[PDB]
Enzyme design. Structure first.
Site, PDB file in Angstrom:
ATOM      1  N   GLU A  61      -0.170  10.469   8.423  1.00  0.00           N
ATOM      2  CA  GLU A  61      -1.389   9.753   8.080  1.00  0.00           C
ATOM      3  C   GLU A  61      -1.983   9.031   9.267  1.00  0.00           C
TER       4      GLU A  61
ATOM      5  N   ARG B 236       5.813 -10.889   7.173  1.00  0.00           N
ATOM      6  CA  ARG B 236       4.673 -10.137   6.681  1.00  0.00           C
ATOM      7  C   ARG B 236       4.432 -10.318   5.190  1.00  0.00           C
TER       8      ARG B 236
ATOM      9  N   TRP C 255       0.809  -1.222   0.000  1.00  0.00           N
ATOM     10  CA  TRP C 255       0.000   0.000   0.000  1.00  0.00           C
ATOM     11  C   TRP C 255       0.836   1.263   0.000  1.00  0.00           C
TER      12      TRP C 255
ATOM     13  N   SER D 243     -13.929  12.195  23.469  1.00  0.00           N
ATOM     14  CA  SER D 243     -14.242  13.221  24.479  1.00  0.00           C
ATOM     15  C   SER D 243     -15.748  13.303  24.581  1.00  0.00           C
TER      16      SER D 243
ATOM     17  N   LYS E 191      -3.826  12.462  27.414  1.00  0.00           N
ATOM     18  CA  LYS E 191      -5.171  12.236  26.882  1.00  0.00           C
ATOM     19  C   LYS E 191      -5.834  11.030  27.507  1.00  0.00           C
TER      20      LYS E 191
ATOM     21  N   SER F 103      -8.609  15.263  -2.867  1.00  0.00           N
ATOM     22  CA  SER F 103      -9.777  15.220  -1.980  1.00  0.00           C
ATOM     23  C   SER F 103      -9.414  15.871  -0.635  1.00  0.00           C
ATOM     24  N   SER F 104      -8.469  15.277   0.072  1.00  0.00           N
ATOM     25  CA  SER F 104      -8.071  15.627   1.410  1.00  0.00           C
ATOM     26  C   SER F 104      -7.588  17.035   1.582  1.00  0.00           C
TER      27      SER F 104
ATOM     28  N   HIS G   2      11.306   5.760  11.757  1.00  0.00           N
ATOM     29  CA  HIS G   2      10.983   4.646  12.620  1.00  0.00           C
ATOM     30  C   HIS G   2      10.415   3.629  11.675  1.00  0.00           C
ATOM     31  N   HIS G   3       9.789   3.960  10.544  1.00  0.00           N
ATOM     32  CA  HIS G   3       9.379   2.889   9.631  1.00  0.00           C
ATOM     33  C   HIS G   3      10.492   2.411   8.704  1.00  0.00           C
TER      34      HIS G   3
HETATM   35  C1  HEA Z   1      -3.997   4.944  14.341  1.00  0.00           C
HETATM   36  C2  HEA Z   1      -2.879   4.349  13.818  1.00  0.00           C
HETATM   37  C3  HEA Z   1      -1.677   4.347  14.506  1.00  0.00           C
HETATM   38  C4  HEA Z   1      -1.272   5.002  15.621  1.00  0.00           C
HETATM   39  C5  HEA Z   1      -2.023   5.929  16.503  1.00  0.00           C
HETATM   40  C6  HEA Z   1       0.093   4.615  15.835  1.00  0.00           C
HETATM   41  C7  HEA Z   1       0.784   5.018  16.932  1.00  0.00           C
HETATM   42  C8  HEA Z   1       2.085   4.657  17.163  1.00  0.00           C
HETATM   43  N1  HEA Z   1       2.883   3.854  16.328  1.00  0.00           N
HETATM   44 FE1  HEA Z   1       2.387   3.005  14.563  1.00  0.00          FE
HETATM   45  N2  HEA Z   1       1.834   2.187  12.998  1.00  0.00           N
HETATM   46  C9  HEA Z   1       0.620   2.225  12.389  1.00  0.00           C
HETATM   47  C10 HEA Z   1      -0.473   2.917  12.886  1.00  0.00           C
HETATM   48  C11 HEA Z   1      -0.479   3.613  14.049  1.00  0.00           C
HETATM   49  N3  HEA Z   1       0.591   3.759  14.862  1.00  0.00           N
HETATM   50  C12 HEA Z   1       0.610   1.467  11.139  1.00  0.00           C
HETATM   51  C13 HEA Z   1      -0.527   1.251  10.149  1.00  0.00           C
HETATM   52  C14 HEA Z   1       1.876   0.987  11.011  1.00  0.00           C
HETATM   53  C15 HEA Z   1       2.483   0.108   9.908  1.00  0.00           C
HETATM   54  C16 HEA Z   1       2.751   0.693   8.551  1.00  0.00           C
HETATM   55  C17 HEA Z   1       3.259  -0.241   7.499  1.00  0.00           C
HETATM   56  O1  HEA Z   1       4.493  -0.477   7.559  1.00  0.00           O
HETATM   57  O2  HEA Z   1       2.551  -0.780   6.582  1.00  0.00           O
HETATM   58  C18 HEA Z   1       2.596   1.459  12.166  1.00  0.00           C
HETATM   59  C19 HEA Z   1       3.924   1.227  12.347  1.00  0.00           C
HETATM   60  C20 HEA Z   1       4.676   1.642  13.412  1.00  0.00           C
HETATM   61  C21 HEA Z   1       6.097   1.394  13.527  1.00  0.00           C
HETATM   62  C22 HEA Z   1       6.976   0.637  12.537  1.00  0.00           C
HETATM   63  C23 HEA Z   1       6.724  -0.852  12.385  1.00  0.00           C
HETATM   64  C24 HEA Z   1       7.815  -1.550  11.595  1.00  0.00           C
HETATM   65  O3  HEA Z   1       8.936  -1.519  12.139  1.00  0.00           O
HETATM   66  O4  HEA Z   1       7.507  -2.074  10.521  1.00  0.00           O
HETATM   67  C25 HEA Z   1       6.485   2.026  14.624  1.00  0.00           C
HETATM   68  C26 HEA Z   1       7.941   2.065  15.090  1.00  0.00           C
HETATM   69  O5  HEA Z   1       8.430   3.099  15.612  1.00  0.00           O
HETATM   70  C27 HEA Z   1       5.295   2.627  15.206  1.00  0.00           C
HETATM   71  C28 HEA Z   1       5.226   3.355  16.408  1.00  0.00           C
HETATM   72  C29 HEA Z   1       4.092   3.908  16.959  1.00  0.00           C
HETATM   73  C30 HEA Z   1       4.051   4.685  18.194  1.00  0.00           C
HETATM   74  C31 HEA Z   1       5.209   4.925  19.150  1.00  0.00           C
HETATM   75  C32 HEA Z   1       2.801   5.146  18.326  1.00  0.00           C
HETATM   76  C33 HEA Z   1       2.210   6.024  19.387  1.00  0.00           C
HETATM   77  O6  HEA Z   1       1.411   6.984  18.640  1.00  0.00           O
HETATM   78  C34 HEA Z   1       1.357   5.427  20.506  1.00  0.00           C
HETATM   79  C35 HEA Z   1       1.302   6.291  21.787  1.00  0.00           C
HETATM   80  C36 HEA Z   1       0.366   5.748  22.816  1.00  0.00           C
HETATM   81  C37 HEA Z   1       0.843   5.328  24.008  1.00  0.00           C
HETATM   82  C38 HEA Z   1       2.283   5.403  24.304  1.00  0.00           C
HETATM   83  C39 HEA Z   1      -0.028   4.792  25.061  1.00  0.00           C
HETATM   84  C40 HEA Z   1      -0.706   5.990  25.743  1.00  0.00           C
HETATM   85  C41 HEA Z   1       0.326   6.453  26.718  1.00  0.00           C
HETATM   86  C42 HEA Z   1       0.098   6.122  27.990  1.00  0.00           C
HETATM   87  C43 HEA Z   1      -1.099   5.355  28.381  1.00  0.00           C
HETATM   88  C44 HEA Z   1       1.074   6.522  29.059  1.00  0.00           C
HETATM   89  C45 HEA Z   1       1.497   5.223  29.779  1.00  0.00           C
HETATM   90  C46 HEA Z   1       2.457   4.429  28.949  1.00  0.00           C
HETATM   91  C47 HEA Z   1       3.741   4.705  28.589  1.00  0.00           C
HETATM   92  C48 HEA Z   1       4.414   5.971  29.023  1.00  0.00           C
HETATM   93  C49 HEA Z   1       4.663   3.845  27.729  1.00  0.00           C
HETATM   94  N4  HEA Z   1       4.177   2.367  14.423  1.00  0.00           N
HETATM   95  C1  HEA Z   2      -7.525   0.902   9.244  1.00  0.00           C
HETATM   96  C2  HEA Z   2      -7.701   0.004   8.283  1.00  0.00           C
HETATM   97  C3  HEA Z   2      -7.704  -1.379   8.338  1.00  0.00           C
HETATM   98  C4  HEA Z   2      -8.726  -2.113   8.802  1.00  0.00           C
HETATM   99  C5  HEA Z   2     -10.014  -1.533   9.352  1.00  0.00           C
HETATM  100  C6  HEA Z   2      -8.292  -3.458   8.702  1.00  0.00           C
HETATM  101  C7  HEA Z   2      -9.058  -4.488   9.136  1.00  0.00           C
HETATM  102  C8  HEA Z   2      -8.704  -5.815   9.070  1.00  0.00           C
HETATM  103  N1  HEA Z   2      -7.486  -6.284   8.613  1.00  0.00           N
HETATM  104 FE1  HEA Z   2      -5.890  -5.264   7.851  1.00  0.00          FE
HETATM  105  N2  HEA Z   2      -4.522  -4.261   7.113  1.00  0.00           N
HETATM  106  C9  HEA Z   2      -4.467  -2.905   6.957  1.00  0.00           C
HETATM  107  C10 HEA Z   2      -5.472  -2.011   7.359  1.00  0.00           C
HETATM  108  C11 HEA Z   2      -6.670  -2.339   7.931  1.00  0.00           C
HETATM  109  N3  HEA Z   2      -7.005  -3.620   8.144  1.00  0.00           N
HETATM  110  C12 HEA Z   2      -3.201  -2.501   6.362  1.00  0.00           C
HETATM  111  C13 HEA Z   2      -2.760  -1.085   6.004  1.00  0.00           C
HETATM  112  C14 HEA Z   2      -2.511  -3.657   6.207  1.00  0.00           C
HETATM  113  C15 HEA Z   2      -1.097  -3.885   5.637  1.00  0.00           C
HETATM  114  C16 HEA Z   2      -1.094  -3.825   4.099  1.00  0.00           C
HETATM  115  C17 HEA Z   2       0.177  -4.215   3.415  1.00  0.00           C
HETATM  116  O1  HEA Z   2       0.838  -5.146   3.923  1.00  0.00           O
HETATM  117  O2  HEA Z   2       0.616  -3.656   2.353  1.00  0.00           O
HETATM  118  C18 HEA Z   2      -3.326  -4.730   6.695  1.00  0.00           C
HETATM  119  C19 HEA Z   2      -2.937  -6.047   6.791  1.00  0.00           C
HETATM  120  C20 HEA Z   2      -3.720  -7.085   7.252  1.00  0.00           C
HETATM  121  C21 HEA Z   2      -3.283  -8.447   7.375  1.00  0.00           C
HETATM  122  C22 HEA Z   2      -2.004  -9.265   7.104  1.00  0.00           C
HETATM  123  C23 HEA Z   2      -1.234  -8.917   5.877  1.00  0.00           C
HETATM  124  C24 HEA Z   2      -0.016  -9.728   5.610  1.00  0.00           C
HETATM  125  O3  HEA Z   2      -0.010 -10.962   5.554  1.00  0.00           O
HETATM  126  O4  HEA Z   2       1.015  -9.090   5.433  1.00  0.00           O
HETATM  127  C25 HEA Z   2      -4.285  -9.136   7.958  1.00  0.00           C
HETATM  128  C26 HEA Z   2      -3.989 -10.579   8.219  1.00  0.00           C
HETATM  129  O5  HEA Z   2      -4.758 -11.521   8.206  1.00  0.00           O
HETATM  130  C27 HEA Z   2      -5.348  -8.183   8.154  1.00  0.00           C
HETATM  131  C28 HEA Z   2      -6.577  -8.520   8.713  1.00  0.00           C
HETATM  132  C29 HEA Z   2      -7.602  -7.630   8.919  1.00  0.00           C
HETATM  133  C30 HEA Z   2      -8.904  -7.972   9.507  1.00  0.00           C
HETATM  134  C31 HEA Z   2      -9.320  -9.375   9.901  1.00  0.00           C
HETATM  135  C32 HEA Z   2      -9.602  -6.851   9.585  1.00  0.00           C
HETATM  136  C33 HEA Z   2     -10.984  -6.516  10.089  1.00  0.00           C
HETATM  137  O6  HEA Z   2     -11.956  -7.096   9.136  1.00  0.00           O
HETATM  138  C34 HEA Z   2     -11.291  -6.967  11.523  1.00  0.00           C
HETATM  139  C35 HEA Z   2     -12.067  -6.021  12.443  1.00  0.00           C
HETATM  140  C36 HEA Z   2     -12.575  -4.805  11.666  1.00  0.00           C
HETATM  141  C37 HEA Z   2     -13.805  -5.042  11.148  1.00  0.00           C
HETATM  142  C38 HEA Z   2     -14.301  -6.410  11.495  1.00  0.00           C
HETATM  143  C39 HEA Z   2     -14.604  -4.130  10.366  1.00  0.00           C
HETATM  144  C40 HEA Z   2     -14.204  -2.708  10.407  1.00  0.00           C
HETATM  145  C41 HEA Z   2     -15.067  -2.006   9.408  1.00  0.00           C
HETATM  146  C42 HEA Z   2     -15.045  -0.662   9.384  1.00  0.00           C
HETATM  147  C43 HEA Z   2     -14.223   0.082  10.333  1.00  0.00           C
HETATM  148  C44 HEA Z   2     -15.843   0.136   8.430  1.00  0.00           C
HETATM  149  C45 HEA Z   2     -15.773   1.670   8.469  1.00  0.00           C
HETATM  150  C46 HEA Z   2     -17.027   2.148   7.770  1.00  0.00           C
HETATM  151  C47 HEA Z   2     -18.180   2.484   8.390  1.00  0.00           C
HETATM  152  C48 HEA Z   2     -18.410   2.448   9.894  1.00  0.00           C
HETATM  153  C49 HEA Z   2     -19.448   2.968   7.740  1.00  0.00           C
HETATM  154  N4  HEA Z   2      -4.986  -6.927   7.708  1.00  0.00           N
HETATM  155 CU   LIG Z   3       5.115   6.039  11.994  1.00  0.00          CU
END
Ligand code: HEA
Ligand code: HEA
Ligand SMILES: [Cu+2]
Ligand SMILES: CCCCCCCCCCCCCCCCCC(=O)OC[C@H](COP(=O)(O)OCCN)OC(=O)CCCCCCCCCCCCCCCCC
Ligand SMILES: CCCCCCCCCCCCCCCCCC(=O)OC[C@H](COP(=O)(O)OCCN)OC(=O)CCCCCCCCCCCCCCCCC
Ligand SMILES: CCCCCCCCCCCCCCCCCC(=O)OC[C@H](COP(=O)(O)OCCN)OC(=O)CCCCCCCCCCCCCCCCC
Ligand SMILES: CCCCCCCCCCCCCCCCCC(=O)OC[C@H](COP(=O)(O)OCCN)OC(=O)CCCCCCCCCCCCCCCCC
Ligand SMILES: CCCCCCCCCCCCCCCCCC(=O)OC[C@H](COP(=O)(O)OCCN)OC(=O)CCCCCCCCCCCCCCCCC
Ligand SMILES: CCCCCCCCCCCCCCCCCC(=O)OC[C@H](COP(=O)(O)OCCN)OC(=O)CCCCCCCCCCCCCCCCC
Ligand SMILES: [Ca+2]
Ligand SMILES: [Cu+2]
Ligand SMILES: [Cu+2]
Ligand SMILES: [Mg+2]
Lengths: 265, 547, 42, 260
Positions: free
Chosen positions: B273, B468, B159, B286, B349, B187-188, B320-321
């Site tokens: 993103e 993966r 993706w 909230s 938060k 769009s965005s 980090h990615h």
């Molecule tokens: C909503 C989506 C979402 C959000 C919010 C985040 C949030 C975070 N993500 Fe990410 N992340 C993804 C979506 C998200 N991520 C996706 C999709 C990927 C994979 C992309 C791809 O390769 O295809 C990814 C990948 C990804 C990686 C790389 C994976 C790899 O190596 O391939 C990393 C590494 O640094 C990372 C880090 C984090 C961190 C530090 C946060 C932080 O934002 C989280 C902060 C929250 C907390 C820390 C908890 C709340 C804090 C407390 C409760 C205080 C108490 C606890 C402590 C002080 C520790 N994320």
């Molecule tokens: C935020 C988006 C998103 C969501 C919602 C999901 C949902 C799910 N995804 Fe995933 N998934 C990705 C984003 C997301 N995914 C991405 C970015 C990757 C990596 C791609 C890549 O490797 O290139 C990935 C990869 C990925 C993998 C592994 C890929 C691999 O082998 O490398 C698997 C494995 O089985 C998986 C499973 C699922 C399942 C079971 C659900 C869900 O079906 C389970 C629970 C959620 C639901 C059951 C329904 C949620 C429906 C909605 C939220 C609808 C919103 C609309 C309205 C409310 C009107 N996803």
């Molecule tokens: Cu990141």
């Protein structure tokens, strides 16, 4: 609105947006076609439609302003929106500059990244910054002054011959940039394919030449408006955006000029 | 109000938001079903479903056979089908399901109400955002059916589209996907600019920026990050396009290119993103917590500034990615260290939410179950990230399923929870018909159970080395894949329930007649209007005491 | 009840004034940071 | 044959510790896991508690407070000191793994679409390694009577199907090996769980990694970066043997036979 207490602008339905989105789907799907051996007809259709949509939509934008819809805040809403547009523009270039500065700093060579190669690329012949480059930077600086001068006159003296005079002068010089820019391509010492330098060089000034043309067209439409009397010292929003835009075009070129022609030789 | 007039030429922000919801809903199911496909195929070892022999049959033919198991012996492993699925998911989800619902559905419709604004600053341009979202979707979907890698259809790349696999893949599949992301980025950005002029220009008298709802603040920060991040992605993907169709060599070593520079410019938007997705979810939480705990949101300024803290850090932690792609140790520390800092902001938060609940009387209505789920599962998701933030532990965790679980906890059990929280919470307000407290509870429980089964197992697999984007795996990973797979069918069942619950509701749902059908603690300007709201909300501007 | 243009825009004008300052603050803070980095680590 | 570093049915933990970096990775994760096991639990316990202690029938009337300075401060410093802590124990592990030693052996790994290329620049040895089911060996990447039998003859078992390769990279225990990874076409990534090491193979780049084995056996890795269709089908196999046999290996490998 039957009984409103506010000046914001509420709008009748409008088909324009749907139309331009189909145009663009067709445009770009046809553009994919055409890059893969098939024919142009589908891409030019898209663009024809998009351009139709763009002209209506913007026609109506003036139309609406003449209907006096453009109340004090409405005119401020527009100015702000547009300013986010040039901030978006600026970030787009940030991607193009980012590549040029990285390859210029850490050029790939056989032990990369332990050891970097050489820039400019072996056998690449960078252009002379003080023969044509400076010519085009003086042409833009100039126009900039000429276009600002039409702005000031209208707002500050309310002089309307002067206003159109600065516009014409600025418009013709913006097109000259393009002609001189095209000359440079003609006489390039490197190629576009096969070598980072050509990709970065050309895509970077290539996107800037796009904008100039959009600039120069934009001002043309102000000249036209100005000729039919469409601007006053208090109401003059297309004018403010053009001048702000033109200036962005020039600020982008200036940094290109110092980044790519002056610094990287 | 011809049907064509209403939806096809829309100028009203509350109908454009409804359009983005269903639309996003649509594509979510479509995307969602591709996940069942994968889970069927990963349920059990060896390739049973994605066979190469089904290509001979027309598409109408082989399709239906693919929903039924074949013996390993007669199954010919077509890795490309897998790779195309995994990437339709990713692209549909991250560009066409969740941002559109959470940002353009619940943000377009409601941000404006919350500030006491007639409409949105630029109505026509908003409708244009909606329709370019369609174009992209269309182009992205079309892509599944066009000439693509290995003489089959569809671009099985990732993706994120990394070269030189993205550049060298044959066909034009990946060109349509490239331009799909372009339209979605226009769009965005159109949406982004609109929400930025509107909020700072179109607020009601006396509504200072410190007197604005948090839901609206979250759309504000979200909208900033889009504006500054998508344009940088228009550029990295224009460099893929040129290198494929104009024989340029940005990420082509034979001409001095660098695949890694692609990764920097893609992740410089690929990090912003993920906070663009969960920002809106924090804002809807909230509201739901204040409302149903019958108490003011705790630490309102610190919640607003936490928001801005994340989005700003979000633009400086994107390598980090890339911990294993070939980076300097200096690079590895700067990015590890920097990423760790977002934990402060998010925790504040998370605590404030627990705090709001603290001291108030709580009403466990459907909408609050999701908010509480999300509190838990987003933390689960979060922690993980910290582990992944550590460059050292990421070596092992990188590109294994331990990341896939990360991202699904904080995406599928996180921002998705916020998509449903808002659904249940504002379905009457936007429809005149409330939903069944009972079915809503069932749904919630179903999907929390299912979805925990889906991805909790994968933390194991990731620790056990499963890579993966494989279509098949060793014998030692069967156990837990069964579980996961079971889990996703359980979750897919739920999503079906939810669409019938919704369908029912808008058909035979309780007619709503009150202006606030929740309680006195639901204090924002949407609850001061009918139930379904006037087509011109706020001709008369919200009097200062009114709220 | 037409009275186009007579609304009070005091709050918005002050808001835009801040907006224009805050953005400039930002921009220049990044550039001098970009520069910092350049010098230290490039 | 001692097959050590490999997946374990129903396994939820890690792979055996065949080197110092892996030892530390296992210890780094452990520690990190408890500190966030603690936080996770801790965060649920308040949610739970609060939901019941303050459910509307237990406390009919709500409270109006919205700020507690002391508490806020606590909750922002606590996590910041928690994070510093992890830093203390995390930078150090980073540096040991990315700061590369004086080699005792040196291989060069080059990912090619749908196989790996191994080279020992000092000893003039170059061969390739392919999964046993590769179309390069008669099969289509799936189990068949032939596949089964071919692996039995290799020295493997039916269940190690997708991990065993036709050619194994041999190595001496107690020795430092520096692997330089590069990719030949699209990107790939070469790892070994058991060594605690992993690294992408990128066209136009030479990335280095180091590792040292304390024990002998067969350790298995697997492509880690979407490279194409047979992404799933480019196993990695590493063989660590005693030093007396390693030398013998050198000589036997000079005649064109690339098996042990
Ligand atoms: C909503 C989506 C979402 C959000 C919010 C985040 C949030 C975070 N993500 Fe990410 N992340 C993804 C979506 C998200 N991520 C996706 C999709 C990927 C994979 C992309 C791809 O390769 O295809 C990814 C990948 C990804 C990686 C790389 C994976 C790899 O190596 O391939 C990393 C590494 O640094 C990372 C880090 C984090 C961190 C530090 C946060 C932080 O934002 C989280 C902060 C929250 C907390 C820390 C908890 C709340 C804090 C407390 C409760 C205080 C108490 C606890 C402590 C002080 C520790 N994320
Ligand atoms: C935020 C988006 C998103 C969501 C919602 C999901 C949902 C799910 N995804 Fe995933 N998934 C990705 C984003 C997301 N995914 C991405 C970015 C990757 C990596 C791609 C890549 O490797 O290139 C990935 C990869 C990925 C993998 C592994 C890929 C691999 O082998 O490398 C698997 C494995 O089985 C998986 C499973 C699922 C399942 C079971 C659900 C869900 O079906 C389970 C629970 C959620 C639901 C059951 C329904 C949620 C429906 C909605 C939220 C609808 C919103 C609309 C309205 C409310 C009107 N996803
Ligand atoms: Cu990141
Ligand atoms: C080779 C030859 C081919 C020739 C084909 C040419 C086809 C014609 C296309 C030209 C387009 C015309 C442009 C006109 C736009 C300007 C509209 C305008 O000035 O009205 C807007 C309003 C003005 O109001 P105001 O000035 O206050 O009125 C005073 C009257 N008392 O002020 C506003 O509301 C501000 C609005 C600003 C407009 C936005 C512009 C930014 C767009 C840049 C994107 C580039 C797209 C280029 C197309 C490429 C294709 C994808
Ligand atoms: C390092 C930064 C470089 C980035 C490139 C950006 C360059 C900007 C383009 C310059 C164009 C300005 C042209 C001025 C000539 C005529 C127009 C004009 O003077 O408008 C002045 C305006 C004052 O507006 P005002 O009086 O408040 O209007 C109603 C007030 N109620 O004041 C304005 O609102 C002018 C608005 C135009 C802004 C263009 C887009 C701004 C993008 C952010 C750039 C920030 C640059 C950082 C500056 C660092 C300073 C050291
Ligand atoms: C509009 C008119 C004016 C022009 C507008 C545009 C101005 C933009 C000027 C700067 C834009 C970004 C330029 C960044 C240069 C970074 C150079 C680079 O790539 O550093 C190298 C490093 C990768 O190198 P690596 O191969 O990993 O290490 C090998 C070393 N042996 O790469 C890295 O680690 C990344 C380096 C830092 C990343 C910075 C990216 C931020 C981009 C947004 C810039 C915003 C500019 C603000 C505009 C103000 C206007 C109001
Ligand atoms: C990821 C980065 C990719 C870059 C693409 C992003 C956007 C490209 C789309 C082109 C058109 C967008 C121009 C945006 C102008 C923003 C300036 C602004 O604030 O204009 C305000 C005016 C408001 O319009 P309105 O709703 O009608 O308000 C009535 C009030 N009198 O707004 C207007 O004047 C609206 C005029 C719009 C004309 C319709 C054109 C649609 C074309 C879509 C194609 C997009 C393809 C971009 C590809 C980038 C190429 C690398
Ligand atoms: C080191 C790397 C950093 C990484 C990059 C950073 C990206 C940041 C994106 C985050 C955007 C969120 C910013 C939120 C700003 C909040 C500030 C605020 O609202 O202060 C309140 C102040 C008080 O006004 P008051 O009168 O009290 O209340 C309103 C009554 N009318 O209100 C005001 O004075 C009004 C101010 C309006 C808000 C200004 C928004 C612009 C900020 C975005 C910066 C863009 C940077 C651009 C760089 C690219 C330039 C090309
Ligand atoms: C018209 C007249 C005009 C004349 C103009 C004259 C002025 C010219 C202006 C020139 C400005 C160009 C700036 C180029 C920046 C170069 C800095 C750079 O690239 O350093 C990268 C730095 C080191 O890279 P590395 O690979 O370590 O090289 C080490 C070799 N021993 O990489 C590292 O050390 C790794 C650390 C990365 C840390 C990332 C920090 C974030 C960077 C800024 C944030 C960007 C976010 C922007 C947000 C905007 C949105 C609001
Ligand atoms: Ca299977
Ligand atoms: Cu590979
Ligand atoms: Cu691969
Ligand atoms: Mg990877």
């Amino acid at each position: 609105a039957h009984a409103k207490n506010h000046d914001y602008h509420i709008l009748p339905p409008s088909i324009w947006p749907f139309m331009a989105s189909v145009g663009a789907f067709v445009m770009l799907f046809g553009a994919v076609l055409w890059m893969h051996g098939s024919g142009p007809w589908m891409g030019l259709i898209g663009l024809v439609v998009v351009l139709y949509t763009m002209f209506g939509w913007w026609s109506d934008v003036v139309t609406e302003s003449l209907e006096g819809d453009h109340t004090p805040v409405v005119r401020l809403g527009l100015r702000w929106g547009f300013i986010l547009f040039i901030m978006s523009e600026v970030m787009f270039f940030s991607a193009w500059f980012w590549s040029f500065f990285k390859h210029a700093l850490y050029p790939m060579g056989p032990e990369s990244p332990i050891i970097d190669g050489i820039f400019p690329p072996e056998g690449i012949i960078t252009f002379d910054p003080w023969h044509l480059p400076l010519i085009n930077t003086l042409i833009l600086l100039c126009s900039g002054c000429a276009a600002t001068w039409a702005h000031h006159a209208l707002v500050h003296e309310n002089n309307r011959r002067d206003v159109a005079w600065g516009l014409a002068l600025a418009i013709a010089l913006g097109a000259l940039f393009t002609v001189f820019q095209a000359y440079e391509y003609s006489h390039a010492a490197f190629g576009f394919a096969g070598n980072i330098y050509g990709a970065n060089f050309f895509m970077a000034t290539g996107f800037h030449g796009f904008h100039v043309i959009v600039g120069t067209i934009f001002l043309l439409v102000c000249l036209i408006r100005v000729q039919r009397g469409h601007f006053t010292p208090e109401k003059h929003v297309g004018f403010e955006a053009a001048i702000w835009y033109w200036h962005f075009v020039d600020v982008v070129w200036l940094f290109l000029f110092a980044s790519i022609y002056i610094w990287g030789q | 109000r011809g049907f064509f007039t209403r939806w096809f030429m829309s100028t009203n922000h509350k109908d454009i938001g409804v359009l983005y919801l269903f639309t996003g809903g649509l594509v979510g199911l479509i995307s969602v079903a591709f996940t069942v496909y994968m889970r069927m195929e990963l349920m059990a070892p060896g390739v049973q479903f994605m066979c190469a022999e089904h290509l001979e049959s027309g598409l109408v033919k082989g399709f239906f056979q693919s929903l039924w198991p074949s013996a390993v012996e007669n199954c010919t492993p077509n890795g490309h089908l897998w790779n195309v699925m995994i990437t339709g998911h990713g692209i549909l989800m991250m560009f066409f399901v969740v941002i559109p619902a959470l940002f353009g559905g619940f943000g377009n419709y409601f941000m404006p109400l919350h500030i006491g604004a007639p409409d949105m600053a630029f109505p026509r341009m908003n409708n244009l955002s909606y329709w370019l979202y369609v174009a992209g979707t269309s182009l992205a979907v079309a892509s599944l059916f066009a000439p693509g890698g290995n003489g089959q259809l569809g671009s099985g790349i990732g993706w994120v589209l990394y070269p030189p696999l993205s550049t060298s893949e044959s066909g034009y599949s990946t060109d349509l996907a490239i331009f799909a992301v372009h339209l979605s980025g226009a769009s965005s950005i159109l949406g982004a600019i609109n929400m930025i002029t509107t909020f700072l220009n179109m607020r009601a008298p006396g509504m200072t920026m410190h007197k604005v709802p948090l839901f609206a603040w979250s759309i504000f920060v979200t909208a900033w990050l889009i504006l500054l991040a998508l344009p940088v992605l228009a550029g990295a993907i224009t460099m893929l396009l040129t290198d494929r169709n104009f024989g340029t060599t940005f990420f082509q070593p034979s001409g001095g290119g660098d695949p890694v520079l692609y990764q920097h410019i893609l992740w410089f938007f690929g990090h912003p993103e993920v906070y663009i997705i969960v920002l809106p979810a924090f804002g809807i939480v909230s509201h739901v917590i204040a409302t149903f705990a019958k108490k003011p949101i705790f630490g309102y300024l610190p919640m607003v500034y936490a928001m801005v803290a994340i989005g700003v850090l979000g633009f400086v932690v994107w390598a980090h990615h890339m911990y294993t792609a070939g980076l300097s140790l200096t690079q590895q520390s700067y990015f590890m260290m920097a990423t760790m800092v977002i934990a402060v902001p998010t925790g504040i938060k998370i605590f404030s939410w627990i705090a709001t609940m603290w001291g108030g009387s709580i009403e466990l209505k459907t909408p609050m179950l999701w908010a509480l789920g999300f509190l838990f599962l987003f933390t689960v998701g979060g922690v993980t990230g910290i582990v992944l933030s550590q460059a050292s532990v990421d070596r092992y965790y990188h590109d294994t399923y331990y990341v896939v679980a990360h991202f699904h906890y904080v995406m599928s059990l996180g921002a998705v929870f916020g998509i449903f929280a808002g659904i249940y919470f504002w379905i009457g307000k936007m429809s005149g018909r409330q939903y069944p407290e009972w079915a809503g509870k069932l749904h919630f429980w179903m999907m929390f159970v299912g979805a925990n089964l889906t991805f909790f197992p994968q933390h194991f697999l990731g620790r056990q080395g499963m890579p993966r984007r494989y279509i098949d795996y060793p014998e030692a990973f069967a156990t837990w894949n069964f579980v996961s797979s079971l889990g996703a069918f359980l979750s897919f069942a739920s999503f079906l329930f939810f669409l019938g619950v919704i369908f029912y509701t808008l058909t035979r749902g309780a007619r709503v007649t009150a202006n606030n059908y929740w309680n006195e603690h639901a204090d924002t300007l949407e609850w001061t209007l009918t139930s379904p709201p006037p087509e011109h909300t706020f001709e008369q501007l919200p009097k200062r005491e009114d709220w | 009840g037409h009275v186009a243009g007579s609304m009070d825009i005091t709050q918005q004008e002050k808001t835009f004034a801040g907006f224009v300052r805050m953005v400039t603050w930002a921009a220049v803070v990044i550039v001098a940071a970009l520069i910092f980095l350049a010098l230290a680590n490039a | 044959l001692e097959i050590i570093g490999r997946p374990q049915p129903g396994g939820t933990g890690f792979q055996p510790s065949a080197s110092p970096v892996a030892t530390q990775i296992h210890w780094l994760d452990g520690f990190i896991l408890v500190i966030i096991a603690a936080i996770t639990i801790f965060v649920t316990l308040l949610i739970l508690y609060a939901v019941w202690r303050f459910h509307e029938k237990r406390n009919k009337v709500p409270a109006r407070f919205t700020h507690n300075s002391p508490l806020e401060i606590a909750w922002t410093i606590v996590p910041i000191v928690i994070l510093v802590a992890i830093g203390a124990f995390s930078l150090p592990v980073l540096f040991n793994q990315q700061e590369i030693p004086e080699a005792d052996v040196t291989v060069k790994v080059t990912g090619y679409q749908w196989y790996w290329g191994y080279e020992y620049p000092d000893e003039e040895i170059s061969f390739e390694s392919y999964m046993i089911g590769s179309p390069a060996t008669g099969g289509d990447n799936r189990m068949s009577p032939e596949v089964e039998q071919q692996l039995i003859e290799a020295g493997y078992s039916r269940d190690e199907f997708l991990l065993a390769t036709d050619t194994a990279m041999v190595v001496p225990v107690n020795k430092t090996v520096v692997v330089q990874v590069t990719g030949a076409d699209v990107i790939h990534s070469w790892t070994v769980p058991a060594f605690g090491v992993k690294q992408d193979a990128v066209p136009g780049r030479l990335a280095q990694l180091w590792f040292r084995a304390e024990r002998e056996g067969i350790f298995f890795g697997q492509c880690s970066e979407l490279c194409g269709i047979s992404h799933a089908y480019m196993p990695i196999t590493v063989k660590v043997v005693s030093e007396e046999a390693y030398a013998a290996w050198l000589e036997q490998a000079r005649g064109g036979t690339y098996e042990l």
